[PDB]
């Protein structure tokens with residue numbers, strides 16, 4: 198059972214802007230996704246201080262970066278708080294509407310796409326480099342879900358039958374054909390060092406072959 202949803206017009210407009218605007222500094226997508234992972238890890242860590250059983254689904258708090266040249270995917274995995282179905286379908290979009298409006302206003306005033314994270318909609322910078330994004334997520338209070346969108350105004354949500362994750366979120370970037378540099382170890386290392394040097398969780402860059 199796959200459910201198909203329409204983005205709100207404002208988020209669809211944001212996604213088109215990210216896909217269509219000429220902007221060479223695409224590497225900032227990784228900083229934004231790592232920042233989102235760090236925030237999700239902060240949240241489960243804080244909740245565990247008053248309810249340690251929230252870590253029964255996994256004590257380790259970390260971020261993994263997994264390139265796969267055969268699939269042409271870059272996956273950003275965290276063991277953070279995860280997202281519920283309501284987050285995926287309703288709550289994220291509610292927060293994203295006001296963040297998008299503020300970001301658009303800033304852009305017309307002279308800001309650039311790299312400041313997207315200051316408006317809470319940094320996730321959508323994934324579409325600087327990805328033609329499709331798949332998000333697999335598991336929150337302690339809900340089932341494991343797969344969200345997916347190739348933009349074009351719609352996204353899907355289904356219950357995920359793949360490998361159970363325990364708790365957290367995997368963002369799978371199906372890279373555009375001309376963006377395969379973000380599968381190269383030295384390039385990912387360079388970007389993490391430049392933009393994500395002080396993240397308070399271990400970031401493991403997996404190696405291929």
Ligand SMILES: Cc1nc(-c2ccc(CO)cc2)no1
Pocket residue numbers: 233234237275277279285289320332344365366368
């Ligand atoms: C869809 C969608 N997924 C996310 C998202 C994914 C991953 C994280 C970090 O775990 C945070 C937010 N935002 O919109």
